[PDB]
Design a protein around this ligand. Sequence first.
Ligand SMILES: Cc1cc2nc3c(=O)[nH]c(=O)nc-3n(C[C@H](O)[C@H](O)[C@H](O)COP(=O)(O)O)c2cc1C
Ligand SMILES: Cc1cc2nc3c(=O)[nH]c(=O)nc-3n(C[C@H](O)[C@H](O)[C@H](O)COP(=O)(O)O)c2cc1C
Lengths: 168, 168
Amino acid sequence: MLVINGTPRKHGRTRIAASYIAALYHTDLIDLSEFVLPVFNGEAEQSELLKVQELKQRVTKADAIVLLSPEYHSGMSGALKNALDFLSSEQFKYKPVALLAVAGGGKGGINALNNMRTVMRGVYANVIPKQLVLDPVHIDVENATVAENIKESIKELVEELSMFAKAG
Amino acid sequence: MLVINGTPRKHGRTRIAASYIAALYHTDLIDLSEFVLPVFNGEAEQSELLKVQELKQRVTKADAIVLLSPEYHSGMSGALKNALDFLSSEQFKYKPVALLAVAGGGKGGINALNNMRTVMRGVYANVIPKQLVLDPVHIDVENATVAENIKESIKELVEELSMFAKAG
Ligand SMILES: Cc1cc2nc3c(=O)[nH]c(=O)nc-3n(C[C@H](O)[C@H](O)[C@H](O)COP(=O)(O)O)c2cc1C
Ligand SMILES: Cc1cc2nc3c(=O)[nH]c(=O)nc-3n(C[C@H](O)[C@H](O)[C@H](O)COP(=O)(O)O)c2cc1C
């Protein structure tokens, strides 16, 4: 199982959620805060840089992926989209994915999720129905860990994810 | 009037459309293929780099903006979103915008437009109803210019744009 962090900020609330999941479930983690690539420009050499082929590998290797991204202007992080512009259906096709967005509370989050969904569906991925949104109240920035009150949600999300993974 | 190119590829079909409009209408053009910034990471120093404050300026200065982006995985270019993650409502609030996406033909384009719309609405911008999609058939890659068959469309798009610009 793979976990991708969307927040390009080394000190982001989304980064915490990523670490939690990837850790507590022992999964391959790709923190976009440190794992940084160049802004896609569509050029052969680029599609063969350093981190680029590693990204394509780790993604096309995981059975199921847990995609996390913060809501930036009612959409996923420009960082996460840029990294996705390097990949394609060749690494996501029919691959089980579980969307999870981190917003600043309120009604935020839904637009981010739908964005990630529409894009994932475009690369023929398989987004599971169950989706989650983490507000600041769900993140304990104090001890860089998710608040207990949400651990239950996250559980069944990943749990439902694996369910789809085994099915097909 | 401002024109923003979404395609981060110096040799992209979207780049052509951008040049056409910006030229034929004598507007401020920002080609994201050359005007490149670092992948947003949310840090003061960054919010005061080189191109960053220029972007904030040119955008907050234009009366109406013509936003162009290619469809990448049923969404706007990860590059355009990254650049938008630097800006905010402070430079778009109530500012008239006209969305225009460039896809590889077929039914593509709509998902990209809706993306740019939802994001634009997020920064309180003012997206005009009229929106356009340019397929390869509308782009003459041979002489790096838009095909005559579409010049009519583009006309009234920009024309309707300015209409909203003067109203409020
Ligand atoms: C440029 C920028 C735009 C943002 N736009 C929104 C927004 O439209 N809706 C929202 O609910 N939160 C918004 N936020 C807040 C983040 O969703 C919030 O910080 C969340 O905790 C994710 O933080 P992270 O990106 O540092 O991980 C925005 C933050 C930044 C820096
Ligand atoms: C990573 C990548 C993903 C793409 N995804 C789609 C897609 O989902 N649907 C589509 O109709 N075209 C897609 N295209 C094609 C572009 O929309 C098409 O090339 C268009 O002419 C814009 O080209 P430009 O980015 O060179 O300006 C994709 C191109 C690239 C490089």
